[PDB]
A paper describes a structure:
CypB is a peptidyl prolyl cis-trans-isomerase (PPIase) found in the endoplasmic reticulum (ER). CypB plays a significant role in the triple helix folding of collagen. It catalyzes the slow cistrans isomerization of multiple proline residues in the collagen chain. Here, we present the crystal structures of recombinantly produced wild-type and HC-mutant CypB from the horse.
Wild-type and HC CypB were crystallized using the same crystallization conditions in space group C2 with one molecule per asymmetric unit. While slightly weaker, electron density in this region was sufficient to unambiguously model the wild-type structure. The presence of two recombinantly added amino acids (Ala-Met) preceding the natural sequence in our constructs of both HC and normal CypB accounts for a partial stabilization of the N-terminal segment via charge/polar contacts of Ala(−1) with His133 of a neighbor molecule (a zinc ion coordinates this interaction) and hydrophobic environment for Met0 formed by residues Met68, Ala108 and Phe120 of the adjacent molecule. The conformations of N-terminal sequences are only partially populated as revealed by the difference map, therefore variable occupancies were allowed for residues ranging from Ala(−1) to Lys(5). Moreover, weak difference densities from Fo-Fc maps in the vicinity of Ala(−1) to Lys5 suggest that the structure might adopt alternate conformations in this region, but only one conformation could be modeled. The N-terminal sequences appear to be the most flexible, with refined B-factors higher than average. The recently reported crystal structure of human CypB complexed with the proline-rich P-domain of calmegin reveals that the binding involves the N-terminal region of cyclophilin and the surfaces of CypB and P-domain are complementary. The N-terminal region forms part of the P-domain binding interface, contributing several hydrogen bonds. Interactions of CypB with ERp72 and GRp94 also require the N-terminal tail as confirmed by NMR experiments with the strongest chemical shifts observed for residues Lys3, Lys4, Lys5, Lys8.
Numbering used by the authors: -1 to 183
The structure:
Amino acid sequence: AMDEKKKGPKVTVKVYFDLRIGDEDIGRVVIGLFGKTVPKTVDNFVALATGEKGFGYKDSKFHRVIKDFMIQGGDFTRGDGTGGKSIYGERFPDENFKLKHYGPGWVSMANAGKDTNGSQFFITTVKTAWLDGKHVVFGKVLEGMEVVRKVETTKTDGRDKPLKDVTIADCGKIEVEKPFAIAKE
Ligand SMILES: [Zn+2]
Ligand SMILES: [Zn+2]
């Protein structure tokens, strides 16, 4: 079917992450971001990817990895889930819950309760519908899901911490000339 009525959100800008496990380069993940749907949340993520406020994601780690669930990163101040901050302050409100965690590869803000978005985020590796309405969804992996899967399956300890650090060796913004809708899947 042509699915005119099933068009999802528009990708308005992209972010890339070049990842490492230990000292091994493992490839690039490209995330499409929904700047019409959640502009404030997208703008934060993009600025943290460029580093333009003087802090951000470069060389931070994915400190929590749960196979068949998600990979979590963005704590560039403490690397352990205790830190991070947004470009608006330590915390900012949940912008909206228009988007759901539709399937593998959706990108959503980590939080410690209502209105506690900072810099931490997660990339789902399955549909995580139980987070719908609680975590703000703002992007989807468009390229390099296989690289996400490498992280997903890295050995972890009993605290779900990778045994070897998984780091964002490089990151930045990629402009999108014409925004484009993707499927909610
Ligand atoms: Zn080595
Ligand atoms: Zn939660």
